[PDB]
Amino acid sequence: DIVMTQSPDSLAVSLGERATINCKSSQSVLYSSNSKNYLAWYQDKPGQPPKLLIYWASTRESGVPDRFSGSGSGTDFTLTISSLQAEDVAVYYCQQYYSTPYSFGQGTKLEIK
Ligand code: IUM
Ligand SMILES: [Zn+2]
């Protein structure tokens, strides 16, 4: 199974500062025919359903501000929030949908320092 591993498990960043979250896939999720990374990022707020933030590893979902940026190819991916705002507090998850069963990381709890 393709296993997704996030780092760190928890991060306390100060408002206005940058938060960086890593996600590693056990095998490449970069499809050579497409040249696309089947990697997604979700933002999950307490008690709320998860919201899709970025897909194809770097494409932002409609409405998502550009301070959220996803990058990486193959096996190493990153979610960088430039200038963390109070509403950014949530657990962030990466997911691969390269091949079934689709899998997620254990999440990274992002908090205001
Ligand atoms: O808080 U919720 O998937
Ligand atoms: Zn901009």
From Swiss-Prot:
GO terms of biological process kind: adaptive immune response; immune response
Region (Framework-1): 1-23
GO cellular component, one term: plasma membrane
Residue ranges of the region described as Complementarity-determining-1: 24-40
Domain Ig-like, residue spans: 1-101
GO-annotated molecular function: antigen binding
Region (Complementarity-determining-2) residue spans: 56-62
Disulfide bonds: 23-94
Chief localization: secreted
Protein name: Immunoglobulin kappa variable 4-1
Organism: Homo sapiens
Gene that specifies this protein: IGKV4-1
Portion of the full-length sequence here: 21 to 121 of 121
